[PDB]
Amino acid sequence: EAPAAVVTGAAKRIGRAIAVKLHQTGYRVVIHYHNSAEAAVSLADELNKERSNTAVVCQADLTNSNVLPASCEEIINSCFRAFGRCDVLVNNASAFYPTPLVQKTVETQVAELIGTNAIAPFLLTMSFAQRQSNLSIVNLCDAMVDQPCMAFSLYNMGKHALVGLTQSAALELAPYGIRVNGVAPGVSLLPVAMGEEEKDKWRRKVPLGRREASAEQIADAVIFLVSGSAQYITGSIIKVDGGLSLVHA
Amino acid sequence: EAPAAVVTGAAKRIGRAIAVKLHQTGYRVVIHYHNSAEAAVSLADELNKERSNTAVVCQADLTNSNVLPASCEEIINSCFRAFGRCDVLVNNASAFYPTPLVKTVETQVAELIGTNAIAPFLLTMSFAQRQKSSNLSIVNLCDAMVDQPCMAFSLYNMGKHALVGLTQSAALELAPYGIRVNGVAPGVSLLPVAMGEEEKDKWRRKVPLGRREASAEQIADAVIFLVSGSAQYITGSIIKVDGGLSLVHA
Amino acid sequence: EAPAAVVTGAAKRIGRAIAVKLHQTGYRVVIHYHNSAEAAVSLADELNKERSNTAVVCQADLTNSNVLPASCEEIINSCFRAFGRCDVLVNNASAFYPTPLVQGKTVETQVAELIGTNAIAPFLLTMSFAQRQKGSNLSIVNLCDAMVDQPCMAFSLYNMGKHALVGLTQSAALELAPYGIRVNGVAPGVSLLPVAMGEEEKDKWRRKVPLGRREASAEQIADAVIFLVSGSAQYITGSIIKVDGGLSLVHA
Amino acid sequence: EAPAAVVTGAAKRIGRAIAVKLHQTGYRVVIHYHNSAEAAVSLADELNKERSNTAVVCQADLTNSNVLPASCEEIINSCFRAFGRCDVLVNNASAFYPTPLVQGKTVETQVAELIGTNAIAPFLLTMSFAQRQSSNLSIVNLCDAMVDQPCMAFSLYNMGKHALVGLTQSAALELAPYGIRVNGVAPGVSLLPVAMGEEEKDKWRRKVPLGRREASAEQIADAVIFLVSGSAQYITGSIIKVDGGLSLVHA
Ligand SMILES: NC(=O)C1=CN([C@@H]2O[C@H](COP(=O)(O)OP(=O)(O)OC[C@H]3O[C@@H](n4cnc5c(N)ncnc54)[C@H](OP(=O)(O)O)[C@@H]3O)[C@@H](O)[C@H]2O)C=CC1
Ligand SMILES: NC(=O)C1=CN([C@@H]2O[C@H](COP(=O)(O)OP(=O)(O)OC[C@H]3O[C@@H](n4cnc5c(N)ncnc54)[C@H](OP(=O)(O)O)[C@@H]3O)[C@@H](O)[C@H]2O)C=CC1
Ligand SMILES: NC(=O)C1=CN([C@@H]2O[C@H](COP(=O)(O)OP(=O)(O)OC[C@H]3O[C@@H](n4cnc5c(N)ncnc54)[C@H](OP(=O)(O)O)[C@@H]3O)[C@@H](O)[C@H]2O)C=CC1
Ligand SMILES: NC(=O)C1=CN([C@@H]2O[C@H](COP(=O)(O)OP(=O)(O)OC[C@H]3O[C@@H](n4cnc5c(N)ncnc54)[C@H](OP(=O)(O)O)[C@@H]3O)[C@@H](O)[C@H]2O)C=CC1
Ligand SMILES: Nc1nnc(CCC(=O)c2cccs2)s1
Ligand SMILES: Nc1nnc(CCC(=O)c2cccs2)s1
Ligand SMILES: Nc1nnc(CCC(=O)c2cccs2)s1
Ligand SMILES: Nc1nnc(CCC(=O)c2cccs2)s1
Secondary structure, three states: OOEEEEEEOOOHHHHHHHHHHHHEEEEEEEEEEOHHHHHHHHHHHHHHHHHHEEEEEOOOOOOOOOOOOHHHHHHHHHHHHHEEEEOOOOOOOOOOOOOOOOOOHHHHHHHHHHHHHHHHHHHHHHHHHHHHOEEEEEEOOOOOOOOOOOOOOOHHHHHHHHHHHHHHHHHHHHHHHHHEEEEEEEOOOOOOOOOHHHHHHOOOOOOOOOOOOOHHHHHHHHHHHEEEEEEEEHHHOEEEEOOOHHEEE | OOEEEEEEEOOOHHHHHHHHHHOOOOOEEEEOOOOOOOOHHHHHHHHHHHHHOEEEEOOOOOOOOOOHHHHHHHHHHHHHHHHHHOEEEOOOOOOOOOOOOOHHHHHHHHHHHHHHHHHHHHHHHHHOOOOOOOOOOEEEEEOOOOOOOOOOOOHHHHHHHHHHHHHHHHHHHHHHOOOOEEEEEEEEOOOOOOOOOOHHHHHHOOOOOOOOOOOHHHHHHHHHHHHHHHOOOOOOOOEEOOOHHHOOOO | OOOOOOOHHHEEEEHHHHHHHHHHHHHHEEEEOOHHHHHHHHHHHHHHHOOOEEEEEEEEEOOOOOOHHHHHHHHHHHHHHHHHOOOOEEEEEOOOOOOOOOOOOHHHHHHHHHHHHHHHHHHHHHHHHHHHHOOOOEEEEEEEOOOOOOOOOOOOHHHHHHHHHHHHHHHHHHHHHHHHOEEEEEEEEOOOOOOOOOOHHHHHHHHOOOOOOOOHHHHHHHHHHHHHHOOOHHHOOOOOEEEEHHHOOOOO | OOEEEEEEOOOOOOHHHHHHHHHHOOOOOEEEEEOOHHHHHHHHHHHOOOOOOEEEEEEEEOOOOOHHHHHHHHHHHHHHHHHHOOEEEEOOOOOOOOOOOOOOOOOHHHHHHHHHHHHHHHHHHHHHHHHOOOOEEEEEEEOOOOOOOOOOOOHHHHHHHHHHHHHHHHHHHHHHHEEEEEEOOOOEOOOOOOOHHHHHHHHOOOOOOOOOOOOOOHHHHHHHHHHHHHHOOOOOOEEEOOOHHHHOOOO
């Protein structure tokens, strides 16, 4: 019987490459999504075409709120409903936009940025552990977390909290055989709304190849941390940044 | 004329020693509190006995919610109403209790992330918005043990990591306005009120420097340095005040 | 042809496991040794039995001295002589012992061994490795220490060398990236405990490890090395992977 | 009686600023120097005309060698000879220049100077400081805030400053029981090298978020003075960045 993984924000970009690569490794997958319904459903079809009954979709808003715990419990519950087990959780979903200190309500910006990047991962980790071989969690962190983008306070706080969670849950879940690690991209797939000139400005800064990471290169690191080659690894965060975080201003 | 500071959770313990030390240095002070009204008022009276009209109190719950932004705006406003200015913000208030992975979880999230992280972000926003030979700065009370966390304190540890993030992010963003943003990071200081001496001792014995916890006044000393003219080039720094505790392996 | 790797201190323990696992992945290997000749040759014998002329040995003291540059240039040249290429360098050799601040080697000898092996030799080997490609998956892996910020009592010099090694890892990652040479680290917590250590003291450390109350096997350390040199890590440089079972996360 | 401090590389720039501010705080000072004999004697002269018998100079090469231990032992002995005590050691002296990995002095010499001045000498001075020991004893190591975002082709210099972080933490741990605190001060850009042209100076100035300017030597000395003071009696193994946000700025 094949293991199963939840990947949050799996319909597009990095999360999709992660779900595809896990599926290629033999995992059954829950493709969580928020708005990208048609892409998620299309991805599940593609994966079910390759090996039937190996992929389902699962819709959830991961904004912070009083019902977020129920939503997170449901994501994990859906893996058991589909596959009777849940071996891997990948915390990938993330809101990302500026929140300047000096000038959507601030209430909403806090809920979305802290919710998706930190609180939902925490609640998913809780539900993962409570519902419980080679069990592990991978959190998508940020290699630039100590050299953050200007005016991205709330986002930076979320990713910083995600580091805290990675370490805290590694320590706490170790006695249950659950490993908790992170993969930290620098620049990978650049945001759709970012202009081409700004994209080339970031590309030029990467020491290794003057280019961004492909989604697949990020996924490769995830695959390593969930595999048998990482059985002793927990609380570790692997930068996949082409040296970007090493470059001074 | 005298600068003014806001200290959150200033009724007791570390917050109180910080408020007392800032006042002795010549600052007028907003003593913010949540439940400790009698202690906040007593401190205010003591300080006002030293120099008239130099201390006020301000009550607010710093738990995350829809009203939190308004409460934080109000805390900062109280300093302007009382003193006409606000030169220093000290984010000290903090909830601290275990949240094991395996009182509702949404309230734990609201309390632990609210007090330790979101409230400080909101207060920083409001502090800076109102400033848009002056030495403006913010001190965030962090945790020296943030990368070697207490077992089953994930939410608290997440709040404190977030606070490091804010410290760095706000330092970068507010530097053009000449607002410095720094942190003080205790290891073990004033231990929980009722903790047995045998348990207190277990922690004291781990501290390389003197086998004792930090006094609130020693934590306060580092805050005083960071708000002073001797730290005018220091921003985004987090000073550990831990007697070497974070350096000790398991 | 097959890629070629240099592993320093590869005769025993963690270096042996790294050299073995690299050999099993298809690398030809230079087994460097200082005092462990018998061990290095018997590993080469075992590897060459699997695939003929894929393993050679190379002797050198990695202590800091006026001749260290020459010895490091020769370790790297041994790879080019044997195999015609050098694709991977694993800086594994390490001296490890206490150097108390407050009180039969002299202190200047302790400096030469602890800083030489853990930091200077890695730097010189990195330099020679890079120069011999100055005129396709090139990388260096440095054996670091997960406990570097919570150091063993009275191990100042050792700890200085492992800190220096982090610096080397980052500086060389930055400088060599335009040459397509990646530079990373693997950081064990408690793996194979030293032969010198008493059994009760071994169990003391084993008990502190969150993940399974046991030390890392040498092969688990080697697994992270294999990952870092592989095509699955083509965008990774200046990274240091802890392989410590969560030990570094545990407070006093 | 007045406390006494050793400051390495104290003839000029940041080390001088540190020596001056410790002297203004009431310390007697040992002004260590290597080549800057004239400027060292001149500083000692200025300080002694402020208070008699409160400054001495001490010559020493801090390049790594088999004699370096005796040299460092003698620096410490010189403070006890002049002043009868040694309360503070400041590790300030530092060689700084490129060592490209891919292509002057020999590589042996570069290792000896860059690792010796930045790491080995601080280690041996710490050893001798501790061995020779109301009281407020401490050591301050001049580190680098850009240690994890290093200057291109400065491997050996960066290895040394990294090693200095290791020593700061290792010594803090080991000397705590003796009541000796060990901390660091990490500048980003302070006094730029005299060799650097004004255009490259401004380039570096422009990058600093706080004021678009380098730290003054006095601003560095302030943080040193705090760490040696009674306001820091619980602080050990801490490295204070004095960098105006420089290390926080992405590429
Ligand atoms: N791209 C890069 O260069 C970098 C990425 N990272 C991290 O790696 C991970 C993946 O990156 P990337 O693919 O760019 O991520 P994206 O920014 O593309 O976001 C991925 C998914 O997050 C989901 N999401 C956003 N808001 C919510 C919400 N409120 N509730 C539920 N889901 C939500 C969205 O799903 P939907 O489309 O279904 O609505 C989105 O597709 C993230 O954690 C990111 O922070 C870190 C550094 C750099
Ligand atoms: N003490 C130590 O050893 C350590 C302390 N620290 C940090 O140093 C700082 C001060 O420490 P310490 O004195 O122990 O702090 P305490 O735990 O004593 O808490 C300080 C004050 O926080 C306020 N507070 C708690 N919850 C709320 C809330 N929901 N809304 C508003 N205020 C609230 C309380 O005010 P009220 O009484 O008026 O209700 C409390 O008195 C904290 O940030 C702490 O995390 C870090 C490591 C160790
Ligand atoms: N073992 C563990 O738990 C931990 C290991 N590490 C790092 O992992 C790596 C491997 O660890 P481990 O296998 O225990 O290493 P060892 O301590 O067993 O040393 C490995 C080899 O280093 C070589 N060596 C020692 N001194 C010299 C010298 N002066 N010149 C040349 N070679 C020398 C020796 O070769 P020979 O026998 O041929 O003379 C020795 O066999 C090391 O870098 C270590 O620092 C980090 C943390 C923990
Ligand atoms: N300046 C800056 O922007 C930064 C400085 N720092 C650190 O702060 C500290 C002070 O900086 P700065 O004033 O610029 O230092 P300098 O570069 O001016 O060096 C200070 C002194 O180091 C001494 N020195 C050099 N080589 C030797 C040697 N072989 N033996 C003995 N002494 C030697 C020299 O003494 P003499 O003249 O007597 O021969 C020199 O005057 C240093 O540790 C530096 O690395 C860190 C980051 C940035
Ligand atoms: N959820 C997301 N997090 N980060 C994203 C893109 C990151 C990005 O655009 C840059 C990162 C560093 C310089 S630019 S999407
Ligand atoms: N808000 C608070 N944060 N930390 C507090 C007390 C710290 C404490 O008891 C210990 C911290 C680490 C070992 S014991 S109160
Ligand atoms: N060269 C070596 N480096 N580290 C070695 C053994 C590691 C070891 O015993 C411990 C390291 C940290 C706690 S115990 S050998
Ligand atoms: N001993 C010394 N160390 N650092 C010195 C000057 C540092 C310097 O010029 C810069 C550091 C980072 C950008 S420019 S002298």
